[PDB]
């Protein structure tokens, strides 16, 4: 049963089980191509594939590029095999992933970091082509070797960027995992504090905030309460601008910008697919 994966120059311990064919699933280790995601039985098999394999980046269209950081939109109907490999590889780190076979109704947004050998996988998120619940992310993953460095937040930011350009409001697919919930809360706090640092009006509706940020009104309200910024004095509902939080957030925004762990809207070249 699978315990580790060789992935480019990294050797990654798996978290959960994923339904790879029992031929492969019998082995402890699994070698895979870091550019096409085909999986293979042995180091020596991989070396032959790498010598043959043409792909140096995901399939699909590069809709974002800022230097070495890209995002590729992959249609699950036009690249079924790639998206299935991507879903099997994801279930290795998701406690529960809804779907791995029927990838045709999904888009996958694949984030990569380029060095001189090609565009390397950072993480991705899947999105339903047509969601009845207006979910803007179905699943999201930062590859382990890149976790806890700000990439997850960049992926979340991107999913909302797409929502704005679509003129829609979005939300991630319930249920959210522990790691998913912590990261969305962090993001939502940052978006809310930023908005309030910039608004000057005496008042604002939740809908107004939702319209600008593409964040769903319930997640807005939910975050307000998480921050203890929703009060009820003299018979009315108020939003409290906490000076501490905005101050603390500014120092954090300085550190994020000091690195480059931020998505930049002027580098998106996208029109919605359908």
């Amino acid at each position: 049963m699978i315990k580790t994966i060789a992935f480019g120059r990294y050797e990654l311990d798996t978290w959960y089980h994923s339904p790879y064919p029992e031929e492969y699933a019998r082995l402890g280790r699994l070698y895979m191509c870091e550019f096409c995601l085909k999986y293979m039985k042995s180091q020596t098999i991989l070396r032959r594939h790498m010598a043959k394999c043409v792909w140096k980046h995901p399939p699909g269209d590069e809709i974002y590029r800022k230097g070495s950081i890209s995002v590729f939109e992959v249609d699950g109907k036009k690249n079924k095999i790639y998206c299935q490999n991507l879903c099997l590889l994801a279930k290795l780190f998701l406690d529960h992933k809804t779907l791995y076979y029927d990838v045709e109704p999904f888009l996958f947004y694949v984030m990569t970091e380029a060095d001189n050998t090609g565009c390397h996988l950072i993480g991705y998120f899947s999105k339903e082509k047509n969601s009845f619940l207006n979910y803007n992310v179905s699943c999201i993953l930062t590859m382990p070797q890149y976790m806890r460095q700000g990439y997850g937040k960049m992926l979340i930011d991107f999913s909302y960027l797409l929502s704005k350009v679509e003129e829609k409001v979005g939300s991630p697919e319930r249920p959210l995992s522990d790691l998913g919930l912590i990261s969305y809360r962090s993001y939502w706090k940052e978006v809310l504090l930023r908005y309030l640092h910039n608004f000057q009006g005496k008042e604002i509706s939740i809908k107004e905030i939702s319209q600008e940020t593409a964040v769903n009104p319930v997640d807005i309200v939910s975050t307000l309460q998480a921050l203890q910024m929703l009060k009820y004095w003299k018979g009315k509902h108020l939003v409290l601008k906490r000076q501490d939080l905005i101050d603390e957030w500014i120092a954090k925004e300085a550190k994020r910008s000091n690195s480059n762990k931020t998505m930049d809207p002027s580098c998106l070249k996208w029109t919605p697919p359908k």
């Binding site: 005496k202 319930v218 309200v221 929703l230 009820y232 509902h237």
Partner: peptide, 28 residues
Amino acid sequence: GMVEIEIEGRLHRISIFDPLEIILEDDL
């Protein structure tokens, strides 16, 4: 379009369209 959950041990219900007043510190 309304939402609920308590604040300081009191259950409250709010609208997402009504403008909410923003305030700073101010004696409350």
